[PDB]
Amino acid sequence: IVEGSDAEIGMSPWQVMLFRKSPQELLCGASLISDRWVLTAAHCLLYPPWDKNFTENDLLVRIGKHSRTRYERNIEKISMLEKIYIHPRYNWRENLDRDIALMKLKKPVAFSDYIHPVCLPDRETAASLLQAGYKGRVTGWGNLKETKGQPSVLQVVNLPIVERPVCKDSTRIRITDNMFCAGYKPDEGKRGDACEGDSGGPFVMKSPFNNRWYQMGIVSWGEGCDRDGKYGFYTHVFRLKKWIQKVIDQF
């Protein structure tokens, strides 16, 4: 996260760290949506152009974390993956359209002050909150800049949703309805963006109707980090909720 700040303890209890077993390293962010299901970006698990195709046994999920590199004894919980489900129409060949994946844990994780699931939006909450200008929150242990370097603890930044035409005119990549972009415009002064290592993490919004946090997006892609005139792109969670429901219902 660039231009963000240290998260408070228990501020994002649904935050999940996708951890590579060997070598032990941070791969991506993710989110807890139930005691046995974790949501992340498909590109975090599958991306043929870079010879990336992880299997269940190559990864681990660390939940309830704050510190990036330390083993948080008596606080974080480490879970093994039972099965990975990537959207069947995830477009890794072109623009990362439908960049979403689900991971089922081998065993249910125990909720605590530091571990708690986030809500997935309904059509009405999505329609009401997904508006240009409305701000969401992005969290992660990704790099602090495109080029300090890495954060000691979880970072957080609030960013405004951007108008679709502006999103489209900011890049040469083909934008689809399954994506939305966020970030400040050059003339807005304020800055902030996700960066390397934050992918797969959540873009959440707190509903002013019921005071619950909803995950509206998944950190998907960007060209550089916090560059003027550029914006981060996020997977539109509600647009792909039918797929999420289908997977969970069947498995």
Next chain:
Amino acid sequence: GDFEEIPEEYL
């Protein structure tokens, strides 16, 4: 060596 070793119960 950037990350602290995790107990082997997970590695």
Next chain:
Amino acid sequence: ADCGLRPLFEKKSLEDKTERELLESYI
């Protein structure tokens, strides 16, 4: 169910340092 309600915040009626910024943007 109880999703989206944080034990250390909503559950205890405590607000985090920047959630107000989000609320103020929901005009």
